């Protein structure tokens, strides 16, 4: 199993750069609007303690340089929505894909198109951790890079990059400018909480192992969701939601193994360990492949 | 993070190629579509195909090429080793600047996995020392390509043809020559014994340090030859002086001489990881080159 990203071309066609003064970051150009992190309106010194409403009221359309490559896009309107700036421009992006804005849950994976000065550099797959960070790969100038899924021809944008934390993980917002997790777009000390294991993805991984003929760990028992959740938390595993049970449905049907039976097999792995064995070649349980990732790759 | 090149320039070149009941992908550059020649085989032909004999019996109209909703008219065809070349009556306006390159084992490249001419995923792979690649390919993925991007230029280095019994993959360069001792015939084929790409493991250890993890370092050094004696014992590739030189920038950045890092890797090989992990991995990772690490860590 590879970390496998979505093809990035539909998103590459939407990347621009946005500059205010000497502060340059990336923006997303969809129809006649450009979306970008609002901290572009900050001097580096403003970032220590910004008042965004006051900083913005002093700005006009003509203070915003938006460029697709070297080509200027004239800004004709601006507004702030939570931590994102929306810049209306006088040109509709001819490469706009079918798209939507979605807010994802922890455990969901998405592709990130890392960009610098509006120019794509790389694409990779990330999982939103339960502590609402991602283990990204971002350097200076990467803010406004976006994360996305593609379902058919529709691009679902779920992430816009804002921050690198002390442990080296990353934080950002949805495309409505609402941060994932407790973070704020201020240059003040912040830290990720203690992370936990994404149970629904581990279960997806066990289903993947069964699909591939690796099933020593299937035990004879079952459990209730509540009992499993109370046990899992003792191992620093996330509790399951009803939505988690539901998105495991197709893998449960494919294998004939009820979700709660798989939960009992995982409970025994937690309480007794691997005892020297492996699953899909690994003594470690993988938690960054969703049920959909498992189907995408076994498909 | 294992990082692939943005795939858009390549997505604009993928098409679907059908011959008979066989469908796979092609690469449409200027007025030529490149795809695996085994598209021309039946089930019975694949057992032992005399490709020159099978191809001469085909006409342009036996090839259905579809770019999205448009059929491209094939107006000629030739064969170059294991790749079929279909000339079409239309230039692909999305053709990027490009070159065809043959890569060396240990080098990395991005794969755009495609089915029925449609892109499905993008990931990073390395050419293994035994000339396989550990990809993720299913039925219908043949003709998917591997590439690198420098400036605006796409360097194509791989076209996908087959999966081996062990689950690894084999294919050709864009001149149709296989990597490795494989043949585009429907027979079980084993690869040679694989080895671990040592210069890449060392690049990855430097990456682990750059990101603050140094539990595996030690106070010792080693000579190049004594390291290579141990490496070969553990089925690691030998490290060459050019490898040492390529690791220069990472050595400078961390203040850790290459032969010092070799001494740390020697200890890991002889002692294992003792339950610990490096950059989240329980195994030593060998599919990042020095260049890959440098680009992403600077
Ligand atoms: C994009 O503008 C940029 C992307 C960063 C740059 C390096 N890698 C990235 O992902 N973001 C910022 O510079 C961002 C801007 C603020 C207005 C949100 N600042 C940021 O990430 O600051 C980090 C904090 C100060 C919020 S917390 C922190 N991070 C570290 C890292 C190392 C030591 C200590 C530390 N404390």
UniProtKB/Swiss-Prot annotation, chain B:
It catalyses: TSAVLQ-|-SGFRK-NH2 and SGVTFQ-|-GKFKK the two peptides corresponding to the two self-cleavage sites of the SARS 3C-like proteinase are the two most reactive peptide substrates. The enzyme exhibits a strong preference for substrates containing Gln at P1 position and Leu at P2 position. Residues 1-298 form the Peptidase C30 domain. There is a cross-link at residues 2, 87 (Glycyl lysine isopeptide (Lys-Gly) (interchain with G-Cter in ubiquitin)). It comes from the Viruses. The active site is at 38 (for 3cl-pro activity), 142 (nucleophile). Inhibited by pyridone-containing alpha-ketoamides compounds 13a and 13b. In turn, alpha-ketoamide 13b (tert-butyl (1-((S)-1-(((S)-4-(benzylamino)-3,4-dioxo-1-((S)-2-oxopyrrolidin-3-yl)butan-2-yl)amino)-3-cyclopropyl-1-oxopropan-2-yl)-2-oxo-1,2-dihydropyridin-3-yl)carbamate) inhibits SARS-CoV-2 replication in human lung cells. Inhibited ex vivo by michael acceptor inhibitor N3. Inhibited ex vivo by compound 11a and 11b. Residues 1-298 are cytoplasmic. It is found in: Host cytoplasm; Host Golgi apparatus; Host nucleus. 3CL-PRO exists as monomer and homodimer. Only the homodimer shows catalytic activity. Interacts with host FBXO22; this interaction promotes the proteasomal degradation of nsp5. Cleaves the C-terminus of replicase polyprotein at 11 sites. Recognizes substrates containing the core sequence [ILMVF]-Q-|-[SGACN]. Cleaves and inactivates human TRMT1, preventing tRNA guanine(26)-dimethylation of tRNAs. May cleave human NLRP1 in lung epithelial cells, thereby activating the NLRP1 inflammasome pathway. May cleave human GSDMD, triggering alternative GSDME-mediated epithelial cell death upon activation of the NLRP1 inflammasome, which may enhance the release interleukins 1B, 6, 16 and 18. Also able to bind an ADP-ribose-1''-phosphate (ADRP). This is 3C-like proteinase nsp5. It comes from Severe acute respiratory syndrome coronavirus 2 (2019-nCoV).
């Amino acid at each position: 199993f590879r970390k496998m990203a979505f093809p990035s071309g539909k998103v590459e066609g939407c990347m621009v750069q946005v500059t205010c003064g000497t502060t340059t970051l990336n923006g997303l150009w969809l129809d006649d609007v450009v979306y970008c992190p609002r901290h572009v309106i900050c001097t580096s010194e403003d970032m220590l303690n910004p008042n965004y409403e006051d900083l913005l009221i002093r700005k006009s359309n003509h203070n915003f340089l938006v460029q697709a490559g070297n080509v200027q896009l004239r800004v004709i309107g601006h507004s702030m929505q939570n931590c994102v700036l929306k810049l209306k421009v006088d040109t509709a992006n001819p490469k706009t894909p079918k798209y939507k804005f979605v807010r994802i849950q922890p455990g969901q994976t998405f592709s990130v198109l890392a960009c610098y000065n509006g120019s794509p550099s790389g694409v990779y797959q990330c999982a939103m951790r339960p502590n609402f960070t991602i283990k990204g790969s971002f350097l200076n100038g990467s803010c406004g890079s976006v994360g996305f899924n593609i379902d058919y021809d529709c691009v679902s944008f779920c992430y816009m990059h804002h921050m690198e934390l002390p442990t080296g993980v990353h934080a950002g917002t949805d495309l409505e400018g609402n941060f994932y997790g407790p973070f704020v777009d201020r240059q003040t000390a912040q830290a990720a909480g203690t992370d936990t294991t994404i149970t629904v993805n581990v279960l997806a991984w066990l289903y993947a192992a069964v699909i591939n003929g690796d099933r020593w760990f299937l035990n004879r028992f079952t459990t209730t969701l509540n009992d499993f959740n109370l046990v899992a938390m003792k191992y620093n595993y996330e509790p399951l939601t009803q939505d988690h049970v539901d998105i495991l449905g197709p893998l449960s049907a494919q294998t004939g193994i009820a979700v709660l039976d798989m939960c009992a097999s995982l409970k025994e792995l937690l309480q007794n360990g691997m005892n020297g064995r492996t699953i899909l070649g690994s003594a470690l349980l993988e938690d960054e492949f969703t049920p959909f990732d498992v189907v995408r790759q076994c498909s």
